Amino acid sequence: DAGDQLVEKIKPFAKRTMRPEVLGALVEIGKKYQNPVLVSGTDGVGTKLKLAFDWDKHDTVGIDLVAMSVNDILVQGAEPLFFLDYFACGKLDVPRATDVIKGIAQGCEESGCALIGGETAEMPGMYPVGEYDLAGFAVGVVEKENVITGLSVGAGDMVLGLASNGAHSNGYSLIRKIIERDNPDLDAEFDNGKTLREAVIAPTRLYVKPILAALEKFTIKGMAHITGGGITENVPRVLPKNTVAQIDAESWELPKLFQWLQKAGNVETQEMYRTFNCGIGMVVIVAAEDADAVRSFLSGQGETVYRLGCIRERQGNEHQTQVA
Amino acid sequence: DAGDQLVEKIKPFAKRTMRPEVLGDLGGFGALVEIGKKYQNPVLVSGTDGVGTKLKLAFDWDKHDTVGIDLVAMSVNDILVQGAEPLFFLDYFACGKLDVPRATDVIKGIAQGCEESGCALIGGETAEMPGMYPVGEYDLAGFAVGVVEKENVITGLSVGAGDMVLGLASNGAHSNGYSLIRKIIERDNPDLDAEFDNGKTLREAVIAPTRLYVKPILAALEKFTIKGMAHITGGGITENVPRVLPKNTVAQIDAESWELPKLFQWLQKAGNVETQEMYRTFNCGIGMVVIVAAEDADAVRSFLSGQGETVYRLGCIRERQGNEHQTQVA
Ligand SMILES: Nc1ncnc2c1ncn2[C@@H]1O[C@H](COP(=O)(O)OP(=O)(O)NP(=O)(O)O)[C@@H](O)[C@H]1O
Ligand SMILES: Nc1ncnc2c1ncn2[C@@H]1O[C@H](COP(=O)(O)OP(=O)(O)NP(=O)(O)O)[C@@H](O)[C@H]1O
Ligand SMILES: [Mg+2]
Ligand SMILES: [Mg+2]
């Protein structure tokens, strides 16, 4: 069987993601946790899969898949533990599927979680030749007293920003409409020694290792993963009803990729802040007394940290995240 | 947004699946589940699956309120065989254009399958991919997580010659072999609305949702020790039962110990399928296989039957002879 051929080829990829907790697929919880709470989430890649088909580039969308879930569970303080993926298609292409799952496993390695199982469904006729669908599922563990809830966020807290690797996994319907409209030279140098194509399909950044190392030394009051809805619709999810996150627009330069998308797309700036991450992949809220020490740590871990702004008292039905 | 509309419509359905372990409700970056020292050495058991080609019939007949039960059973029944209590569930729903009434119907069945299994439906994802799916069509993926004490993990390693093999009856073909069911139906055009069996139309028999074995099996585990279990999915009876059998044992099934249900009788005739090929393709009326000690077989059969199940004494375990196949039906 094709799927049986695929199962053997991916055994090496998954074997490198294993953890001592991995014993259906059985996972033990480390005695590290006294009162363990499980944090889980599911997601797909979105319309970025369309560029992966069109460009025949399948070895990175698996990193996008994993990041979408492990980064989501990360905001509660959870350490990612294990991951499962579901892969659906019409007729199985073992070399191309192997590439897809190889990237998944690679993203699991970077997140410190084990890829312990999955499912490859062949539905002949439901998918066009060459196309497929991906779903991922992540589970992490956090101590009950260490759950990051955002309830202590109050006026005076400083808003930090972790830089993103590009558009990540959101806003690609617009990126695709633009590219089909301009037919731009996708293989020309675009930024930081990467071609425009390389910048567009760049895999989503994982924040797991530096954020977890940070939590060993500091208290993080809240976090927001910047995905669907951009900055302004995602940060208010951890903010108390009475607080506003005020973002100074000049605290970070808009990366070149988003500068191109707004120009070509002719998008009002406030629509950009609610559509693309605009270079901000993860928002970390901390106490002002900790803001400097955390920024140095996260920068020393390899991240690019900005001081986006601070938390203030809300005035009425005021929007809870304003960039200006 | 359509998806924001769908999340609101399904929140009541998920709220009826909740358990005390679930912290918070639908909506939020992550879904929180506490375990509690109710478990001393807790082990998580998880699985993922889709519905398979049965969705094609769900499209054709415009019956979407039960394939979500099929989705749940495919995963919760899998983790059940290791002795795990299903705890929580997440679903992924992909389509081209979101049809909120139909999506509401699909997820409503998911919640119903979760309610019947005792697991909470705590989260999910609705992806709109315009152009990847024809109008009206969608894809389902589910993820189930259960808990078991490390010492109670059921592995089948103590299965030995002399143990009795019980069989739990199925509701039909469940979630496997449906590409073939569709080829047959599209060729013969049989009256799908005629009475066929047990006062149900043939259509009702074909699209019947997969049976959930969670509540009776977990209740059984309180009173008895189960040596092994098999959920009968792809590969039928003969390819799934040997998964829990030690290298040196064989499960011999007397074919006359249960009647092939009418639905499979029609599929064999219309498909012109060798009988030993049916045992490797369809569940043939056996949804779950339970192996127990011979001294417990009488009480276990009685208990599971009193819980609402149809129990057969499929056969017994014997010593394997060479490269002998580990499950033979005769
Ligand atoms: N896309 C995938 N990604 C990661 N692991 C996979 C994937 N597909 C299969 N596996 C694993 O390889 C093995 C293949 O088993 P599989 O053929 O999928 O049957 P099953 O999962 O037991 N249930 P079923 O889908 O009903 O046949 C399983 O252990 C999987 O966990
Ligand atoms: N099919 C579904 N079934 C159950 N719950 C769902 C489903 N779809 C969405 N939800 C829940 O409603 C909310 C949907 O918002 P969503 O945009 O999917 O959040 P997210 O984790 O940030 N993923 P994304 O924004 O796409 O990167 C989540 O909290 C889900 O738990
Ligand atoms: Mg997400
Ligand atoms: Mg969604």
XYZ file of C-alpha atoms and ligand atoms in Angstrom:
718
model
C 0.000 0.000 0.000
C 1.057 3.585 -0.637
C 0.203 4.654 2.896
C 2.220 1.747 4.273
C 5.151 2.978 2.169
C 4.690 6.468 3.637
C 4.510 5.143 7.197
C 7.928 3.543 6.890
C 9.522 6.646 5.338
C 8.382 8.981 8.140
C 9.410 6.726 11.053
C 12.867 8.411 11.133
C 11.359 11.904 11.141
C 9.091 11.168 14.099
C 11.701 9.168 16.008
C 13.834 12.305 16.366
C 10.982 14.147 18.122
C 10.568 11.611 20.938
C 10.673 12.572 24.632
C 11.095 10.347 27.715
C 7.373 10.813 28.431
C 6.413 8.881 25.277
C 5.902 5.222 26.196
C -3.038 4.255 20.394
C -0.034 6.426 21.302
C 0.767 6.606 25.019
C 2.220 9.653 26.782
C 3.105 9.847 30.477
C 3.131 13.193 32.283
C 6.434 14.121 33.891
C 6.536 14.005 37.671
C 7.829 17.546 37.191
C 4.185 18.668 37.400
C 2.419 18.433 40.755
C -0.986 19.693 39.582
C -0.834 19.336 35.796
C -3.315 21.135 33.548
C -3.534 20.158 29.861
C -3.698 22.865 27.177
C -4.650 21.815 23.655
C -5.529 23.341 20.301
C -6.107 22.447 16.669
C -5.465 24.298 13.446
C -4.684 24.026 9.759
C -2.384 25.993 7.495
C -5.094 28.065 5.784
C -4.799 29.500 2.284
C -0.986 29.258 2.458
C -1.459 25.679 1.179
C -2.435 27.147 -2.197
C 1.016 28.675 -2.703
C 2.500 25.361 -1.605
C 0.625 23.577 -4.402
C 1.329 26.274 -7.007
C 5.050 26.453 -6.206
C 5.400 22.695 -5.445
C 7.034 23.533 -2.103
C 5.881 21.077 0.573
C 8.748 20.748 3.056
C 7.843 23.798 5.206
C 4.030 23.984 5.497
C 4.422 21.354 8.197
C 6.316 23.889 10.268
C 3.435 26.318 9.724
C 0.984 23.648 10.894
C 2.819 22.948 14.137
C 3.502 26.592 14.966
C -0.200 27.408 14.614
C -1.049 25.133 17.559
C 2.034 25.045 19.790
C 2.286 28.858 19.741
C -1.425 29.054 20.571
C -1.118 26.774 23.602
C 2.095 28.563 24.571
C 0.260 31.729 25.658
C -1.207 29.954 28.694
C 2.262 28.921 29.858
C 2.016 25.350 28.590
C 5.038 23.337 27.511
C 4.092 21.489 24.291
C 4.177 17.751 24.929
C 2.815 15.882 21.910
C 1.334 16.508 18.488
C -0.876 14.626 16.028
C -1.519 15.465 12.388
C -4.270 14.445 9.965
C -3.434 14.405 6.250
C -6.189 14.076 3.632
C -5.866 13.850 -0.145
C -7.250 12.090 -3.189
C -4.376 9.882 -4.365
C -1.300 9.587 -2.157
C 1.996 10.947 -3.546
C 4.578 9.377 -1.219
C 7.559 11.664 -2.029
C 5.443 14.809 -1.652
C 3.607 13.556 1.468
C 6.933 12.533 3.031
C 8.060 16.134 2.551
C 4.906 17.499 4.181
C 5.245 15.262 7.220
C 9.022 15.809 7.393
C 8.372 19.507 7.997
C 5.734 18.660 10.606
C 8.226 16.487 12.476
C 10.847 19.205 12.111
C 8.499 21.727 13.715
C 7.832 19.286 16.557
C 11.564 18.979 17.210
C 11.845 22.775 17.440
C 8.881 22.900 19.863
C 10.183 20.115 22.090
C 7.039 18.035 21.550
C 6.809 14.495 20.201
C 4.973 13.641 16.985
C 3.338 10.484 18.325
C 0.825 9.591 15.620
C -1.376 10.742 12.810
C -3.704 9.738 10.033
C -3.337 9.727 6.252
C -6.728 9.522 4.543
C -7.045 8.842 0.814
C -10.439 10.025 -0.476
C -10.264 9.392 -4.239
C -12.148 12.160 -5.994
C -12.602 14.604 -3.102
C -9.340 16.417 -3.863
C -7.784 17.575 -7.143
C -4.614 15.792 -8.164
C -1.709 17.283 -6.259
C -3.748 19.005 -3.528
C -4.246 17.980 0.096
C -5.587 19.161 3.455
C -3.749 19.367 6.812
C -4.993 19.518 10.393
C -2.748 19.555 13.442
C -3.407 18.905 17.137
C -1.122 19.971 19.998
C -1.169 19.149 23.718
C 0.899 20.897 26.381
C 1.121 20.815 30.177
C 1.176 23.639 32.725
C 0.954 23.751 36.511
C -2.434 24.965 37.772
C -0.841 27.870 39.645
C 1.262 28.779 36.583
C -1.635 29.186 34.139
C -1.204 32.526 32.375
C -4.678 34.071 32.399
C -4.178 37.813 31.835
C -6.243 38.654 34.938
C -3.400 40.605 36.527
C -2.900 42.840 33.472
C -3.333 46.415 34.657
C -2.525 49.960 33.634
C 1.231 50.448 33.737
C 2.221 47.077 32.279
C 4.638 47.241 29.345
C 3.757 45.610 26.004
C 6.662 43.790 24.323
C 6.744 42.452 20.782
C 8.462 39.348 19.377
C 9.346 39.712 15.714
C 7.769 37.414 13.141
C 9.368 35.590 10.210
C 6.892 37.015 7.664
C 3.178 36.685 7.013
C 3.224 33.304 8.848
C -0.124 31.590 8.145
C -2.691 34.390 7.803
C -3.601 36.805 5.032
C -2.494 34.609 2.121
C -5.701 34.970 0.121
C -4.637 38.589 -0.306
C -0.993 37.719 -0.957
C -2.148 35.351 -3.684
C -4.604 37.745 -5.359
C -1.833 40.370 -5.475
C 0.769 38.027 -6.979
C -1.683 36.858 -9.652
C -2.450 40.529 -10.415
C 1.097 41.950 -10.557
C 2.950 38.819 -11.799
C 5.991 40.103 -9.858
C 9.500 38.812 -10.365
C 9.229 36.271 -7.545
C 12.830 35.117 -7.928
C 14.541 38.508 -7.565
C 16.330 39.588 -4.397
C 13.751 41.139 -2.090
C 15.071 41.528 1.466
C 17.808 40.235 3.795
C 19.201 38.100 0.979
C 15.945 36.242 0.333
C 13.955 36.234 -2.893
C 10.392 37.525 -2.849
C 9.190 33.935 -3.142
C 11.401 32.888 -0.223
C 10.001 35.723 1.905
C 6.382 34.884 1.070
C 6.479 31.171 1.868
C 8.876 31.502 4.829
C 7.671 29.160 7.615
C 5.966 30.518 10.714
C 8.266 31.292 13.628
C 8.125 29.129 16.771
C 8.336 30.968 20.098
C 8.267 27.892 22.336
C 11.868 27.492 23.486
C 12.688 31.146 24.353
C 9.316 31.830 25.990
C 9.597 28.693 28.125
C 13.154 29.559 29.135
C 11.873 33.031 30.024
C 9.119 31.589 32.234
C 11.800 29.875 34.307
C 13.071 33.300 35.403
C 10.165 35.753 35.001
C 6.411 36.117 35.371
C 4.573 36.856 32.137
C 1.237 38.498 32.773
C -0.263 37.686 29.386
C 0.495 36.635 25.841
C -1.191 36.856 22.449
C -0.257 34.882 19.326
C -0.737 37.085 16.274
C -2.709 35.069 13.712
C -6.141 35.644 12.177
C -7.256 39.227 12.684
C -3.748 40.651 12.986
C -2.493 42.653 15.932
C -5.567 44.667 16.875
C -8.024 41.766 16.996
C -5.724 39.289 18.798
C -4.135 41.270 21.665
C -7.485 42.094 23.383
C -8.097 38.370 24.060
C -5.922 38.461 27.206
C -6.825 41.997 28.270
C -9.225 42.675 31.153
C -12.423 44.498 30.200
C -11.107 47.770 31.659
C -7.714 47.900 29.939
C -6.434 49.063 26.563
C -3.171 48.146 24.843
C -1.755 51.322 23.309
C 0.759 50.564 20.551
C 3.217 53.194 19.336
C 3.387 52.660 15.583
C 6.952 54.023 15.437
C 8.305 51.478 17.940
C 9.096 49.026 15.132
C 9.690 49.315 11.400
C 7.186 47.612 9.138
C 9.150 44.820 7.404
C 9.640 45.076 3.654
C 7.244 42.207 2.899
C 4.297 44.028 4.480
C 5.413 47.324 2.949
C 5.024 45.658 -0.453
C 1.641 44.137 0.402
C 0.060 47.420 1.525
C 1.390 49.310 -1.501
C 0.285 46.665 -3.996
C -2.927 45.984 -2.102
C -3.769 49.654 -1.446
C -4.909 48.822 2.086
C -5.800 51.416 4.693
C -3.180 51.187 7.419
C -5.690 50.227 10.110
C -6.917 47.406 7.880
C -3.328 46.148 7.748
C -3.072 46.071 11.552
C -6.207 43.870 11.579
C -5.161 41.527 8.746
C -1.407 40.865 8.798
C 0.839 40.483 11.813
C 2.876 43.377 10.326
C 6.085 41.900 11.736
C 4.792 41.070 15.236
C 4.326 37.355 15.792
C 3.906 37.242 19.554
C 2.901 39.896 22.102
C 4.187 39.505 25.669
C 2.745 41.654 28.482
C 4.871 41.963 31.629
C 5.133 44.202 34.657
C 6.954 47.447 33.915
C 9.473 46.605 36.650
C 10.285 43.427 34.711
C 10.026 44.894 31.202
C 13.727 45.650 30.728
C 15.000 42.369 32.188
C 12.609 40.303 30.058
C 13.461 42.229 26.872
C 17.160 41.511 27.370
C 16.497 37.824 28.000
C 14.279 37.357 24.952
C 16.776 39.279 22.837
C 19.580 37.107 24.207
C 17.587 34.016 23.267
C 17.678 35.059 19.601
C 14.425 37.001 19.309
C 13.940 40.554 18.068
C 12.060 42.381 20.822
C 10.272 45.718 20.531
C 8.715 47.904 23.220
C 5.333 48.319 21.523
C 3.662 50.309 24.286
C 1.860 49.836 27.591
C -1.513 49.101 29.192
C -3.840 51.964 30.170
C -7.321 52.381 31.625
C -10.120 51.943 29.086
C -12.529 54.796 28.335
C -15.964 53.371 27.588
C -16.495 51.168 24.537
C -12.944 52.159 23.532
C -11.238 49.557 21.382
C -8.929 47.458 23.523
C -5.952 47.570 21.142
C -5.086 50.750 19.261
C -1.996 51.274 17.120
C -0.981 54.905 16.640
C -17.929 36.556 9.757
C -19.528 33.195 8.960
C -17.199 31.228 11.234
C -17.891 33.611 14.106
C -21.582 32.898 13.454
C -20.948 29.140 13.505
C -19.063 29.242 16.822
C -22.046 30.956 18.466
C -24.530 28.428 17.115
C -22.533 25.410 18.374
C -21.672 26.750 21.841
C -24.914 25.314 23.328
C -24.131 21.893 21.850
C -20.634 21.796 23.330
C -21.790 23.151 26.696
C -23.908 20.014 27.146
C -20.740 17.861 26.798
C -18.845 19.493 29.673
C -17.102 17.661 32.523
C -15.846 19.012 35.866
C -12.238 18.700 34.647
C -12.845 21.324 31.917
C -11.729 24.825 32.948
C -13.366 27.665 31.050
C -15.579 27.341 27.995
C -15.436 27.641 24.212
C -13.500 30.708 23.129
C -9.889 31.438 24.029
C -6.389 30.738 22.753
C -6.219 27.282 24.349
C -8.602 24.811 25.956
C -7.808 23.919 29.568
C -8.407 20.499 31.145
C -7.304 19.576 34.650
C -6.451 15.971 35.445
C -6.405 15.895 39.224
C -4.655 13.428 41.530
C -7.704 11.172 40.970
C -5.046 9.533 38.760
C -1.845 8.464 40.538
C 0.315 7.834 37.445
C -1.876 9.264 34.679
C -1.143 8.248 31.092
C -2.669 10.097 28.162
C -4.001 8.082 25.214
C -4.833 10.013 22.054
C -5.832 9.403 18.466
C -6.930 11.186 15.319
C -9.103 10.133 12.396
C -11.478 11.327 9.718
C -14.770 9.889 8.518
C -13.504 8.507 5.198
C -15.546 7.972 2.055
C -18.781 7.801 4.069
C -18.852 11.605 3.787
C -19.567 11.184 0.066
C -22.885 9.524 0.971
C -23.494 12.247 3.549
C -23.273 14.778 0.721
C -25.380 12.741 -1.694
C -28.267 12.174 0.722
C -27.992 15.562 2.494
C -27.775 13.795 5.864
C -25.030 15.473 7.903
C -26.269 15.235 11.504
C -24.733 11.796 12.176
C -21.330 11.656 10.419
C -20.065 13.689 13.380
C -20.960 10.722 15.564
C -18.955 8.577 13.141
C -16.053 10.997 13.510
C -16.020 10.746 17.313
C -16.394 6.964 17.470
C -13.422 6.449 15.140
C -11.086 8.012 17.735
C -12.757 7.431 21.108
C -13.275 3.721 20.350
C -9.574 3.511 19.422
C -8.356 4.958 22.712
C -10.943 2.863 24.558
C -9.188 -0.410 23.659
C -6.122 0.602 25.677
C -8.325 1.064 28.742
C -8.389 4.851 28.474
C -11.318 6.908 29.647
C -12.076 9.478 26.916
C -11.631 12.957 28.354
C -11.813 15.686 25.700
C -12.259 16.147 21.955
C -11.380 18.698 19.262
C -12.596 18.837 15.659
C -11.260 20.424 12.494
C -13.814 21.409 9.835
C -12.631 22.490 6.376
C -14.690 23.631 3.385
C -14.702 26.014 0.439
C -17.637 28.232 1.395
C -19.033 27.806 4.891
C -22.708 26.771 5.049
C -23.599 27.639 8.628
C -26.770 25.497 8.876
C -24.986 22.420 7.492
C -21.847 23.034 9.538
C -24.077 23.483 12.591
C -25.613 20.090 11.760
C -22.222 18.388 11.413
C -20.829 19.758 14.651
C -24.108 19.032 16.439
C -23.508 15.339 15.757
C -19.922 15.638 17.010
C -21.189 17.035 20.309
C -23.734 14.218 20.481
C -21.004 11.650 19.979
C -18.985 13.419 22.672
C -21.944 13.390 25.067
C -22.464 9.674 24.530
C -18.752 8.981 25.201
C -18.472 11.165 28.297
C -15.789 13.387 26.749
C -15.950 17.151 26.453
C -15.880 18.908 23.084
C -13.575 21.746 24.115
C -12.375 23.312 20.892
C -11.887 23.181 17.187
C -11.195 25.011 13.965
C -13.345 26.042 11.012
C -11.261 26.622 7.866
C -12.771 28.215 4.754
C -10.616 27.423 1.696
C -12.522 28.870 -1.268
C -11.854 26.612 -4.223
C -10.451 23.553 -2.465
C -13.877 21.988 -1.932
C -16.936 21.840 -4.195
C -19.985 23.733 -2.988
C -21.584 21.822 -0.150
C -18.634 19.538 0.582
C -16.297 19.546 3.578
C -13.655 17.531 5.436
C -13.682 16.385 9.061
C -10.745 15.491 11.291
C -11.116 14.649 14.953
C -8.749 14.362 17.916
C -9.588 12.486 21.122
C -7.575 12.316 24.356
C -8.221 9.862 27.175
C -6.631 8.975 30.513
C -5.596 5.674 32.118
C -3.442 4.697 35.078
C -0.103 3.321 33.884
C -0.793 0.020 35.670
C -4.212 -0.302 33.997
C -3.039 0.090 30.378
C -4.553 -2.829 28.464
C -1.883 -4.307 26.174
C -3.019 -7.897 25.547
C 0.300 -9.347 26.717
C -1.467 -11.683 29.187
C -3.769 -13.103 26.473
C -3.230 -16.857 26.496
C -4.659 -20.031 25.016
C -8.027 -20.795 26.592
C -9.289 -17.197 26.794
C -12.728 -16.442 25.389
C -13.196 -13.956 22.548
C -16.419 -11.963 22.848
C -17.882 -9.784 20.129
C -19.869 -6.574 20.443
C -22.370 -6.094 17.632
C -22.039 -3.166 15.244
C -24.620 -0.719 13.930
C -23.572 -1.476 10.330
C -20.468 -0.811 8.240
C -19.606 2.068 10.618
C -16.869 4.116 8.883
C -15.074 1.668 6.571
C -15.713 0.066 3.204
C -17.908 2.898 1.935
C -16.238 3.453 -1.435
C -17.535 -0.032 -2.217
C -20.998 0.589 -0.757
C -21.248 3.615 -3.047
C -20.080 1.782 -6.183
C -22.774 -0.842 -5.556
C -25.576 1.646 -4.863
C -24.690 3.794 -7.882
C -24.825 0.668 -10.097
C -27.987 -1.077 -8.870
C -30.050 2.010 -7.894
C -31.897 0.031 -5.180
C -34.948 1.501 -3.481
C -33.113 3.143 -0.581
C -36.429 4.096 1.074
C -37.939 0.609 1.337
C -38.095 -1.311 4.591
C -34.919 -3.382 4.710
C -34.224 -4.609 8.250
C -35.413 -4.049 11.831
C -38.068 -1.616 10.602
C -35.492 0.732 9.072
C -35.128 1.773 5.454
C -32.091 0.639 3.485
C -30.796 4.220 3.518
C -31.100 4.333 7.309
C -29.127 1.078 7.463
C -26.356 2.350 5.166
C -25.728 5.701 6.870
C -26.236 4.448 10.444
C -23.617 6.101 12.705
C -20.785 4.076 14.218
C -21.662 2.596 17.592
C -19.873 3.942 20.672
C -18.591 1.325 23.115
C -17.216 3.706 25.749
C -19.887 3.691 28.455
C -20.446 -0.113 28.655
C -16.760 -1.087 28.306
C -15.621 1.399 30.953
C -18.389 0.198 33.275
C -17.247 -3.370 32.598
C -13.662 -2.462 33.533
C -14.881 -1.495 37.009
C -16.038 -5.073 37.629
C -13.801 -7.233 35.408
C -10.307 -7.434 33.953
C -10.225 -7.237 30.145
C -7.141 -8.850 28.633
C -7.381 -7.259 25.182
C -9.670 -5.309 22.884
C -9.874 -4.511 19.175
C -11.851 -1.823 17.359
C -12.843 -3.254 13.964
C -12.044 -0.613 11.327
C -9.942 -0.825 8.137
C -9.037 -4.411 7.323
C -12.141 -5.857 8.963
C -12.156 -8.565 11.604
C -9.125 -10.541 10.451
C -6.719 -7.585 10.104
C -7.622 -5.742 13.340
C -7.936 -8.482 15.986
C -4.287 -9.666 15.655
C -3.134 -6.214 16.854
C -3.611 -7.258 20.510
C -2.591 -10.890 20.110
C 0.827 -12.131 21.287
C 3.071 -13.571 18.584
C 2.250 -17.150 19.650
C -1.560 -17.003 19.879
C -4.393 -17.330 17.375
C -8.029 -16.235 17.663
C -10.262 -18.925 16.125
C -13.771 -17.636 15.347
C -16.627 -20.065 14.689
C -18.529 -18.421 11.845
C -21.894 -19.759 13.048
C -21.653 -17.934 16.410
C -23.346 -14.825 14.966
C -25.519 -14.166 11.932
C -24.160 -11.903 9.218
C -26.540 -8.911 9.358
C -28.809 -8.257 6.398
C -26.848 -5.160 5.353
C -23.660 -7.179 4.821
C -25.575 -10.079 3.240
C -26.690 -7.700 0.490
C -23.185 -6.247 0.129
C -21.631 -9.694 -0.310
C -24.135 -10.750 -2.993
C -24.088 -7.457 -4.906
C -20.292 -7.213 -4.610
C -19.592 -10.877 -5.471
C -17.094 -10.994 -2.608
C -15.384 -14.102 -1.262
C -16.411 -14.727 2.342
C -12.820 -14.600 3.615
C -12.434 -11.305 1.730
C -15.463 -9.873 3.557
C -13.854 -10.697 6.920
C -10.886 -8.533 5.832
C -12.936 -5.580 4.516
C -16.156 -5.005 6.498
C -16.793 -5.448 10.202
C -19.504 -7.991 9.240
C -21.547 -7.103 12.329
C -18.688 -7.076 14.882
C -17.856 -3.561 16.060
C -15.617 -4.413 19.013
C -13.762 -7.585 20.023
C -13.262 -8.246 23.758
C -10.893 -10.925 25.086
C -11.413 -12.112 28.686
C -10.466 -15.035 30.917
C -12.541 -18.168 30.432
C -13.835 -18.082 34.015
C -15.084 -14.503 33.498
C -16.652 -15.025 30.057
C -20.099 -15.861 31.440
C -20.334 -12.862 33.777
C -18.781 -10.454 31.255
C -21.204 -11.524 28.525
C -24.077 -11.040 30.970
C -22.879 -7.640 32.225
C -22.257 -6.155 28.774
C -25.622 -7.498 27.579
C -27.323 -5.885 30.580
C -25.607 -2.593 29.702
C -27.481 -2.576 26.369
C -25.039 -4.340 24.029
C -25.463 -7.380 21.793
C -22.737 -9.814 22.845
C -21.515 -12.849 20.921
C -19.114 -15.564 22.025
C -17.017 -15.366 18.886
C -14.516 -18.040 19.860
C -11.312 -18.635 21.785
C -7.535 -18.126 21.838
C -5.219 -20.993 20.884
C -1.503 -21.568 20.373
C -0.134 -20.449 16.998
C 1.577 -22.946 14.665
C 4.330 -21.291 12.614
C 3.570 -18.349 10.302
C -0.149 -19.114 10.880
C -2.488 -16.156 10.476
C -3.420 -14.806 13.892
C -7.179 -14.533 13.202
C -9.019 -17.214 11.212
C -12.806 -17.395 10.803
C -14.351 -20.848 10.415
N 0.152 11.818 8.506
C 0.600 10.917 9.577
N 1.342 11.657 10.377
C 1.911 11.109 11.478
N 1.721 9.800 11.766
C 0.963 9.033 10.948
C 0.406 9.578 9.864
N -0.293 8.625 9.226
C -0.170 7.479 9.923
N 0.601 7.711 10.977
C 0.949 6.696 11.990
O 1.372 5.314 11.239
C 0.520 4.366 11.581
C -0.460 4.063 10.393
O -1.659 3.494 10.864
P -3.045 3.740 10.026
O -2.943 3.124 8.656
O -3.296 5.237 9.891
O -4.316 3.054 10.832
P -4.984 3.607 12.238
O -4.391 4.949 12.590
O -4.685 2.627 13.351
N -6.658 3.762 12.077
P -7.483 3.776 10.556
O -7.312 5.125 9.872
O -8.980 3.518 10.808
O -6.947 2.713 9.653
C -0.227 4.902 12.809
O 0.399 4.545 13.959
C -0.127 6.447 12.682
O -0.073 7.025 14.054
N -15.490 23.371 14.483
C -15.217 23.986 15.798
N -15.586 23.117 16.737
C -15.449 23.418 18.048
N -14.940 24.619 18.430
C -14.571 25.503 17.483
C -14.703 25.200 16.183
N -14.270 26.233 15.449
C -13.864 27.179 16.319
N -14.042 26.751 17.564
C -13.712 27.498 18.789
O -14.095 29.068 18.582
C -12.977 29.761 18.457
C -12.630 29.977 16.937
O -11.673 30.984 16.754
P -10.257 30.628 16.022
O -10.022 31.679 14.969
O -10.347 29.271 15.343
O -9.060 30.635 17.177
P -7.426 30.404 17.001
O -6.976 29.335 17.964
O -6.660 31.666 17.344
N -7.057 29.905 15.429
P -6.630 30.979 14.141
O -7.108 32.369 14.411
O -7.263 30.476 12.850
O -5.099 30.995 13.979
C -11.923 28.908 19.174
O -11.849 29.253 20.488
C -12.431 27.432 19.003
O -12.156 26.622 20.221
Mg -4.090 29.775 15.735
Mg -11.463 29.007 13.256
